[PDB]
């Protein structure tokens, strides 16, 4: 697929894509049953530029979000709220599992010691 606007955003390690517990029963099924379409890899920038976590985090998600509608759309395609938020929730753990490398290899850095 081509994205096209990701010009300095960088593809993150791919892991097991968490499951959630949205509490109701008809949400556990739409994600497990979608999960298929959803990004099995998340899209992030050098955390030496950011500052808060919360913010890389942010970007680094949703960045993955339109990522993924931008380039399923082009074709007569669009998403829906729910598949996004779904999305969101996962995509968020997910982030911080991949940032976590990232975080650690910019605390390495700052002088190192």
């Excluded at 499951?19 to 298929?36: A, C, L, Q, V």
């Excluded at 380039?71 to 995509?91: A, L, P, Q, S, W």
């Excluded at 968020?92 to 975080?103: F, I, N």
Aim: aromatic share 14%; charged share 20%; with cysteine.
């Amino acid at each position: 697929s081509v994205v096209g606007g990701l010009g300095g955003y960088m593809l993150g390690s791919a892991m097991s894509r968490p499951m959630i517990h949205f509490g109701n029963d008809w949400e556990d099924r739409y994600y497990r049953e979608n999960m298929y379409r959803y990004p099995n890899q998340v899209y992030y920038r050098p955390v030496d530029q950011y500052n808060n976590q919360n913010n890389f985090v942010h970007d680094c998600v949703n960045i993955t979000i339109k990522q993924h509608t931008v380039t399923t759309t082009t074709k007569g395609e669009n998403f829906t709220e729910t598949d996004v938020k779904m999305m969101e929730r996962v995509v968020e753990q997910m982030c911080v599992t991949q940032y976590q490398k990232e975080s650690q290899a910019y605390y390495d850095g700052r002088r190192s010691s």
